[PDB]
Symmetry: D2
Subunit: 196 residues, 4 copies
């Protein structure tokens, strides 16, 4: 069982950067749909599994990756934002940032470039590479979850699906990316980082 997580703010807490209408639809509609479909897919897989039905398992697994990934991605995203967010990180996170990307600006520039460049719906990720021990930027198609498909540990995600910005910024993703920086919860990103 999986559930739709309650936000730690209210829908309008991020205005004017991300309007309340987007936050409400994104949470109670889009994320809700992924959780519901995820639960369905996984009561189905559990019975395909019990019967040893390999064909059903494999047919199931675009559904499970899309909805399961949708749940994982959005669950992290909500925690990645805050009405008291914005600014720059401090401590080991900032030290690591300029160590792997040169500076906070270069990092910001590369993450923005990765998110805006996604063809179609997708996500832009700052991740941690456990093996190599360094920060890394990656982009995922649709709702493919970062860790499950790449191995990298997710620290910060920028959702570039049209439903995350279109009603407010239309076709101009650059404006969407430029605005979100003001509400990123660097306190949460650092927590994620330290746990690695």
């Amino acid at each position: 069982k999986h559930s739709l997580p309650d936000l730690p703010y209210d829908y309008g807490a991020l205005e004017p950067h991300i309007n309340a209408q987007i936050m409400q639809l994104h949470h109670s509609k889009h994320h809700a749909a992924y959780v519901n479909n995820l639960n369905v897919t996984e009561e189905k897989y559990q019975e395909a599994l019990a019967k040893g039905d390999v064909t059903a398992q494999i047919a199931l697994q675009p559904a499970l990756k899309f909805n399961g990934g949708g749940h994982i991605n959005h669950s992290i995203f909500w925690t990645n934002l805050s009405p008291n967010g914005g600014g720059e990180p401090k401590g080991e996170l900032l030290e690591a940032i300029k160590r792997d990307f040169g500076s906070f600006d270069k990092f910001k520039e590369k993450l923005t470039a990765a998110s805006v460049g996604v063809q179609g719906s997708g996500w832009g990720w700052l991740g941690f590479n456990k093996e190599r021990g360094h920060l890394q930027i990656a982009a995922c198609p649709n709702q493919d979850p970062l860790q499950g498909t790449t191995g990298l540990i997710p620290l910060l995600g920028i959702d570039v699906w049209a439903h995350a910005y279109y009603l407010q910024y239309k076709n101009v993703r650059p404006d969407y990316l430029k605005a979100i920086w003001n509400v990123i919860n660097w306190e949460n990103v650092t927590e994620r980082y330290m746990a690695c």
Copy 2:
């Protein structure tokens, strides 16, 4: 060279089914971006080709498929719609429809199911199978063009990228699909069909 095609109507000609704001953005912004990037990609490929630079050719070819496909898909789409559209087809097209899908309703039902089911951005296609000589429904991811990636001849396309309906129907694709039936130019679809 490729150019942005002039519409055969004005932006508001399809109201209330598809509002004027969507038609304007979709044409002068989204389609325009694909044509521009397409032309860039193909003056680049032409010089990669002249130098025998295989690596550059292969690096180029997500760009070319995405923007080139974007141009092809939208160019057909505009002709697929009409303010005098709607209703049902007549002649050999309707005969072929119920012959391959049972009835116009079953067909309509399956095409709607294919479009609404697309994970992420994509297109739903009624196509013609030259080899087998029958109608066929297919769905393509992002801007992958039907013929170039499937071999099927495109007859009718339903664009399910959020930029084609979100401002008006939000997350409810079913409402978007239900509305578009009233402005489909069956006269154009039949032309496409007869040419096969």
Copy 3:
């Protein structure tokens, strides 16, 4: 768990078309590995599902598809071959082949083309489409199973992984394809066809 099925004949029963060495390697080494790995992966997957670990499930997915498909594909393949095979089929399978492909020779020409044209490792597939009600030819990459990833019901499968012909026909697949027609078990393909 799953099991390596016994072969319906001796390893050297398909000579000279497919030598005993290949049959022995293909069955007792390759197919056995898929079963063993399939079981290890399923056990795994059962643990991830119990804990609701979506990430573990999504990460497990390529291992399960590859091994699950390996087991499925090969299990069908063994029954598709016979020392008393060869020639053409009779009954309605034959009429269906005429109806959907023109003639038996056109069918084998197209199934051979789909098999030889597989880039890298893969399978050429005669299948049945329940939706349309007709036979259809498809090719699958590596060990992706026909039904699970396509919806088509498998009738006859041709394995074009190098481990199925390289020792005997080297770089020449056409020679392999040409030879295999002599050991096709049409009785089995007919049974599979009458079942759906």
Copy 4:
């Protein structure tokens, strides 16, 4: 056009690690086919580009990637091997390997893992990342070229297509990988490394 490069040594020069039969087949049959097909595809592509036929270009894409990559990958591979190869590298390539992987043995352990773990046909790739400035290991499906699809500059390539080891090591890739370390041309990998 493109050309099948001559081999820097005789076909039996890598014995007993890679027998003459494989080397002869791999070079004069497989690589030659990629070059020939690459040239036919390019000529083609030149015609489609002249006419501005986007559909023909997009349809041509898998043929060109597969053959173009085949030619690129194999051309690098021949220079990566030598009768006087084997042992370890010296100079800064060695320090870079220590710095980015810990030790030479950890590097070969990881490059071997990436190569043996390739599902189906593919390549294991040592590469250099110009953006980050460090060595990196990557695996590519079938004939997809490293640079063109990844951005990484190729230094050392290990071919795991069955046609590169099956005749000699059958189903056991680890034996093949274990053997190949004896003929690696570190002089060439060093030159490729110093160039970028």
